[PDB]
């Protein structure tokens, strides 16, 4: 089988295994801080450098994957804690949208909220223009921030959140298990057929954004990943 | 919400938080050895003492859970490596079947392979009588060892295997990710309605068995678990 | 050429191929537990029974060797995790020091920390009396536990650690590669002239010790070894 | 820390993690055949796609690495079993030398036998022009196929050879351990300062060449690699 696996316990600048796009900045403690607090409509994304081949056109096979990661959102004085983080999968040629307004677009879509990606968001601001739930929420997105499905959640400031995601090639199910600092778990699942939504090779990464009045610290702390494609 | 969570990094006898059934024994290193290598048709089961309320007849809600465990199977000289380990969920009054032949029944079913339980099996022997796959395999079982669904796998002697299981109340999906010692991952998923197959209160646990000529070391090294039931 | 090679994927009692000295005990899962958790100043050592000719007096030649093994140290409640395991080479007539205090001596030296051996230590406790570094470490020992050279390391409870050793006769260089469970590698290398420090025939083996209040589970799980001495 | 690791138990076409250069072809059994048996001065190289950061100009640190791999060379009728395989490390922009004559250049150097790389060769043909020992041999090359150091070896046709390499950043020691199918080991070592001979970012891989009358099957079967750079 064809397996891809990596494990970051801390990050550093100048590491060929990662692509930094936009306002991303590596902190002295090894954390990745996605957006710049002093910039309007700041967008910062981090991608794993090597493109992963999630499905084969010759075998028609799709990959299964297990990935776990932890992040932290923290309030800054005077600004609204917005907009949130998003773990996504997108074509290898993926780039931050031209003229991106950041904000509720999460750094991955256009003004209408359309884009070419699939991912799980942790939304801390309800954008009525994208049909956001009235509360913080975790969501599954397929080519749009107007979530296919969402589950009510609570973003605690300065709280380390651990997430685990499982994609099963057979059922084409994408499972997510979020563990809040207080101990409670929030799970959400949905059948998304990657073979039909994304090309053969893609790139995994995280993104975050802010607006003029919406800014908060968005931190990625660790990230392990393992995918396996049946080659036969 | 109503959450239940424990984490065993090592086990010990006389700990009131665990039930020992059958030939189970706790090794000096803190591991739990499920079967007795000297006994014919040995069956051993370890259960978390406190029953967990997976669903409510009052609210009709079903809980969601995240659990992670690791095990190790090892070959012993002269005997065939059989039969396997099974992570199961069963009524609080669950006991090893009367007159259990061990072997292909993994300690949870009768001779015909029927019983009242739901779980993930790691089968190292093909029992044609239970329509077993021709290879080692992981499988989802619902009230029988004639698996509802299986996926080819490979048991590596002396290799420490890691399992992540997530159950999403909403979509009733049970997702399993198995990370082999060589790095490769194996995922299997299936929709199972706990509310219709199991009572409000259940017990989580592990069970392994052997026959006369089928014996091997079945070890449980660690196990963390968290379930949350929405109470409203 | 003259080559000696063996491979233990699991051990057993009553195997004339191995020497058990002290509190050693072979677990039902085949692992070797070096110390007794209930004894004060427990010392346990295991040696490969047949002596290996590491150098010829006639030809002046020294043998090269490649050896690989895996262990596991696990904490036990109420006691400090000590003292560590040491892979050693010693005279065929080697035995545990008379009146051994266990502890910092690692079962291979006297109270001053002096003995006849060459080895690699995985020290989990800082013994000032032997100039131990302030943290966990891997060290190279030539006739003393006051390491010739050390490198910071981290012992993780219940984690299986793999180690690779290569000794090249020409450069008299002993290189060590430790693979922690988290993925990272810790290497350390040193020039040690075996011909001048040890006799023509030696015995390879492991050893671990504890004191009154310092005890932990020390396990050896597997061991492959090969050496070749040019005979011409 | 900064760790990079991968594990290839078999290879496959169209895999984004590998760069194929020259006459490389992936066989149905998942083996890589480096040279074309019907081509004069055939050359084939296969590299890991992601460039690895071996040292940091900011910290002045060098990484350490453990790598294990197996290969097989086989004789084809009428042609001389030539020329051998070489595991090398070169600058990320590395390519097959223009007008490479194959043969004793091993695909990594010009006609004079010079180039920019470091590596371990398994040379099956004595090229006087490069001061080749009169027998088959394993050697350490630093910017030239005129080995800095060699050790006599024997290449058995159709035999699967295992090789283990370790590089300790501290001593700057590159140690190799070769295991012949017959059981005997061949070790070789040498202090090479990578920080001085190679740039910050390099790519690892294997190369193989042949001439008009020198041809044989060069197969790569597996390859595991792990390197760690202290980031602080
Ligand atoms: C489209 C736009 O950028 N509007 C600005 C406001 O943006 C929203 O801000 C919230 C937080 O209040 C959140 O980040 C949301 O996604 C944004 O669309 C906000 O920045 C406001 C403060 O003056 O200015 C608006 O123009
Ligand atoms: C029904 C029964 O117990 N039959 C015995 C055999 O049991 C099978 O053994 C395999 C391993 O071969 C495996 O554990 C399977 O589940 C069992 O049904 C086996 O013990 C055999 C050896 O002599 O005796 C049969 O009577
Ligand atoms: C000399 C001696 O044996 N002292 C006892 C202590 O031993 C040290 O203990 C540490 C762990 O705390 C470690 O083993 C070290 O190698 C030993 O020197 C320790 O056992 C202590 C607990 O009460 O009693 C001392 O007297
Ligand atoms: C420089 C060159 O290409 N010479 C040809 C010979 O090449 C050598 O062949 C041996 C095996 O005989 C080996 O590969 C060596 O590295 C090569 O240089 C050889 O092919 C010969 C047969 O007619 O022709 C030469 O010109
Ligand atoms: Ca939003
Ligand atoms: Ca079976
Ligand atoms: Ca010590
Ligand atoms: Ca040559
Ligand atoms: Mn949203
Ligand atoms: Mn089965
Ligand atoms: Mn020490
Ligand atoms: Mn040469």
According to DSSP, residue C96 is labeled: P
Query: For every residue of B66-87, which 3-state class applies, written as one string?
Result: EEEEEEEEECCCCCECCCEEEE
Nearest CA to CA, how far is A118 from chain B (Å)?
19
Backbone CA torsion sign across A72, A78, A79, A81: positive
Find the ligand nearest to C210 CA: 3
Solving technique for this entry? X-ray
Give the H or E element holding residue D85: strand D84-91
C167 is in an annotated binding site: no
C-alpha–C-alpha distance, residues D202 and A215, integer Å: 39
- Nearest residue in A to C182, CA atom: A7
C-alpha–C-alpha distance, residues D165 and D89, integer Å: 13
Contacts of B219 in chain C (CB under 8 A): 29
Give the H or E element holding residue B196: helix B194-197
In angstroms and rounded to an integer, the radius of gyration of the C-alpha atoms of chain D is 17
Q: Whose CA is nearest to atom 18 of ligand 2?
A: B103
C-alpha–C-alpha distance, residues B164 and B175, integer Å: 8
10 Å Cβ neighbour count for B99?
8
C-alpha–C-alpha distance, residues C198 and C205, integer Å: 15
Q: How far is CA B33 from the centre of its chain?
A: 14
Ligand 2 atom closest to residue B82's alpha carbon, by position in its atom list: 14
C-alpha–C-alpha distance, residues C227 and B111, integer Å: 53
Length of chain D: 232
Query: What SS3 class is residue C103?
Result: helix
Q: Does residue D213's CB lie within 6 angstroms of at least one atom of ligand 4?
A: yes
Query: What SS3 class is residue C8?
Result: strand
DSSP states along D86-146: EEEEEETT--PPTT---GGGTTTS-TTSEEEEEEEEEE-S--GGGT--SS-EEEEEEEESS
Resolution of this entry, Å: 2.5
Residue B205's contacts (CB-CB under 8 Å, 6 or more residues apart) are B19, B45, B46, B47, B48, B87, B88, B90, B94
**Chain B contact for D5 (CB, 8 A cutoff):** no
Do residues B83 and B125 lie in contact, with contact meaning Cβ atoms separated by under 8 Å?
yes
B48 is in an annotated binding site: no
Give the H or E element holding residue B197: helix B194-197
Place of tokens 């239940």: B4
DSSP states along B10-75: S--TT-TTEEEEES-EE-TTS-EE-S-TTSTT-EEEEEESS-EE-B-TTT--B-EEEEEEEEEEE-
Pocket test for ligand 4, best of D78, D84, D103 (most atoms within 8 A of CB): D103
Query: What SS3 class is residue C212?
Result: coil
Q: Are strands A201-209 and A52-53 parallel, antiparallel or unpaired?
A: antiparallel
B116 is in an annotated binding site: no
Closest CA to D138 of D85, D88, D67, D181: D85
> Which whole-number Å values give the CA distances from C201 to B221, C19, C198, in the listed order?
40, 16, 8
Closest CA to C86 of C205, C230, C186, C172: C205
**Chain C contact for B29 (CB, 8 A cutoff):** yes
Q: Torsions phi, psi of B130, nearest 5?
A: -120, 25
Query: Where are the extended beta strands (E) located within chain C?
Result: 2-8, 18-22, 25-26, 32-33, 43-48, 52-53, 64-74, 84-91, 114-123, 137-144, 149-152, 159-168, 173-179, 185-191, 201-209, 217-229
**Distance from first CA to last CA of chain D, Å, rounded?**
8
> Which whole-number Å values give the CA distances from A230 to A2, B175, C87, in the listed order?
6, 18, 40
C-alpha–C-alpha distance, residues D68 and D176, integer Å: 10
Q: Does residue D125's CB lie within 6 angstroms of at least one atom of ligand 4?
A: yes
Q: Whose CA is nearest to atom 11 of ligand 2?
A: B214
Closest CA to B33 of C181, C71, C223, C27: C27
Q: Are strands A2-8 and D52-53 parallel, antiparallel or unpaired?
A: unpaired
Structure tokens at D143: 């910017």
C-alpha–C-alpha distance, residues C90 and C208, integer Å: 15
Closest CA to D155 of D73, D223, D232, D228: D73
In angstroms and rounded to an integer, the radius of gyration of the C-alpha atoms of chain C is 17
C-alpha–C-alpha distance, residues A74 and B129, integer Å: 58
Are C28 and B160 an interchain contact pair (Cβ–Cβ within 8 Å)? no
Residue B183's contacts (CB-CB under 8 Å, 6 or more residues apart) are A3, A5, A226, D7
Task: Write b or e for each residue in B61-83: b if 16 or more Cβ atoms lie within 10 A of its Cβ, otherwise e.
Answer: bbbbbbbbbbbbbbbbeeeebbb
Label residue B91 exposed, middle or buried (CB < 10 Å: 0-12, 13-18, 19+). middle
Residue B28's contacts (CB-CB under 8 Å, 6 or more residues apart) are C25, C27, C33, C37, C217
Backbone CA torsion sign across A21, A25, A31, A34: negative
Q: Torsions phi, psi of C112, nearest 5?
A: -75, -15
Ligand 3 atom closest to residue C104's alpha carbon, by position in its atom list: 16
- Domains in chain D (CATH in brackets) are 1-232 (2.60.120.200)
Q: Whose CA is nearest to atom 17 of ligand 2?
A: B103
Residue ranges around ligand 1 (CB below 6 Å): A 80, 82-83, 101, 103-104, 125, 127, 210-214
Give the H or E element holding residue D195: helix D194-197
Are A49 and D50 an interchain contact pair (Cβ–Cβ within 8 Å)? yes
């Amino acid at each position: 089988a064809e397996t891809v696996s990596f494990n970051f316990n801390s990050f550093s600048e100048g590491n060929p295994a990662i692509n930094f796009q936009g306002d991303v900045t590596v902190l002295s403690n090894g954390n990745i801080q996605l957006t710049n607090l002093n910039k309007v409509n700041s967008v910062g994304r981090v991608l794993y450098a090597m493109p992963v081949r999630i499905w084969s056109s010759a075998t028609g096979n799709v990959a299964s994957f297990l990935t776990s990661f932890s992040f932290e959102m923290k309030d800054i004085k005077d600004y609204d804690p917005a907009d949130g983080i998003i773990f996504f999968i997108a074509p290898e040629d993926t780039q931050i949208p031209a003229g991106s307004i950041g904000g509720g677009t999460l750094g991955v879509s256009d003004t209408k909220g359309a884009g070419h990606f699939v991912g799980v968001e942790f939304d801390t601001y309800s954008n009525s223009e994208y049909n956001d739930p009235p509360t913080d929420h975790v969501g599954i997105d397929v080519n749009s921030v107007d979530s296919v499905k969402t589950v009510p959640w609570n973003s605690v400031s300065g709280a380390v959140v651990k997430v685990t995601v499982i994609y099963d090639s057979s059922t084409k199910t994408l499972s997510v298990a979020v563990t809040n600092d207080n101990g409670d778990i929030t799970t959400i699942a949905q059948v998304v057929d990657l073979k039909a939504k994304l090309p053969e090779r893609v790139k995994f990464g995280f993104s975050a954004s802010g607006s003029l009045g919406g800014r908060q610290i968005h931190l990625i702390r660790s990230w392990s990943f393992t995918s396996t494609l049946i080659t036969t």
